[PDB]
Design a binder for this molecule. Structure first.
Ligand SMILES: Cc1cn(-c2nc(Nc3cc(C)c(OCCO)c(C)c3)ncc2F)cc1CN1CC[C@@H](O)C1
Length: 264
């Protein structure tokens, strides 16, 4: 878990920024091979946020989740993760419009598998969005950014709490209640983004107006070229009633079936 700072080389080129500090590309020397890494580098008591993130990531072990290599303490705190070279899903899709619906299905299914695993592990992501899906290849996606994630208690199926309101289920807004079903809501939004080639959801609207729209039963439209069955799934993810909204097992199962029908 604790990494040697002298085995780590960080590139001066920044990769991304935020109110924690930065993220940078680098290399971690293993026994005989060098591993390319993404390093989240810490700049009041937000130290414990990073350790919590690392603590969540240490427990997760799935192909469709970004792997933690370890933590490094030196000059600043540093969370070392494996590198996904192609970067965020939404930016990739914005710049690669030729990508085919079948490819997008493949990627969203991969995300659904990662989230099904996360659901089984009783973790809530609480920030599932296309920006937080990182591409290893055009055909391999991983879920990133566990800074807001929580391990559910063995007796509860939800967590009670600056929010990405556009990705949030009604019960998150109305009751501050975060569950794997609320991750499912966010996945619907993520799907909409993917099939819109990285377009922003609820363009030009304030959170309060988004909340108002959803309350009236209104939902985002079916993106250009999006198969109707995938849009059906988005709407199912946007089921207002948490209890009737499906879990990731059923969401994943629907994606799996549809995808392997497309390869047949
Ligand atoms: C916590 C964290 C981990 N990572 C990682 N990034 C990468 N690869 C990567 C990331 C970006 C943003 C990226 O785009 C750089 C700007 O074009 C590219 C080409 C690769 N590989 C592995 C990682 F673990 C990135 C972050 C920062 N997040 C902020 C919002 C979300 O987009 C990412």
């Amino acid at each position: 878990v604790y990494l040697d700072r002298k085995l780590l080389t960080l590139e001066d080129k920044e990769l991304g920024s935020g109110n924690f500090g930065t993220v940078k590309k680098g290399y971690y020397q293993m026994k005989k091979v060098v591993k390319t890494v993404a390093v989240k580098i810490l700049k009041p008591a937000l130290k414990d946020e990073l350790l919590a993130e690392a603590n969540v990531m240490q427990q997760l072990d799935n192909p469709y989740i970004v792997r933690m290599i370890g933590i490094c303490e030196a000059e600043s705190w540093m969370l070392v993760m494996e590198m996904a070279e192609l970067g965020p899903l939404n930016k990739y899709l914005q710049q690669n419009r030729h990508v085919k619906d079948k490819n997008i299905i493949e990627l969203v299914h991969q995300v659904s598998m990662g989230m099904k695993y996360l659901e089984e592990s009783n973790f809530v992501h609480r920030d599932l969005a296309a920006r937080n899906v990182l591409l290893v290849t055009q055909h391999y996606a991983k879920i990133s950014d566990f800074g807001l994630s929580k391990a559910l208690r063995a007796d509860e199926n939800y967590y009670k709490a600056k929010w990405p309101v556009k990705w949030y289920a009604p019960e998150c807004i109305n009751y501050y209640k975060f569950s794997s079903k609320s991750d499912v809501w966010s996945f619907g939004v993520l799907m909409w983004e993917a099939f819109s080639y990285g377009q922003k959801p609820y363009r030009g609207m304030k959170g309060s107006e988004v909340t108002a729209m959803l309350e009236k039963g209104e939902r985002m439209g079916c993106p250009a070229g999006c198969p109707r069955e995938m849009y059906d799934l988005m709407n199912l993810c946007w089921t207002y009633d948490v209890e009737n909204r499906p879990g990731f097992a059923a969401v994943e199962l629907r994606l799996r079936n549809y995808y392997y029908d497309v390869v047949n």
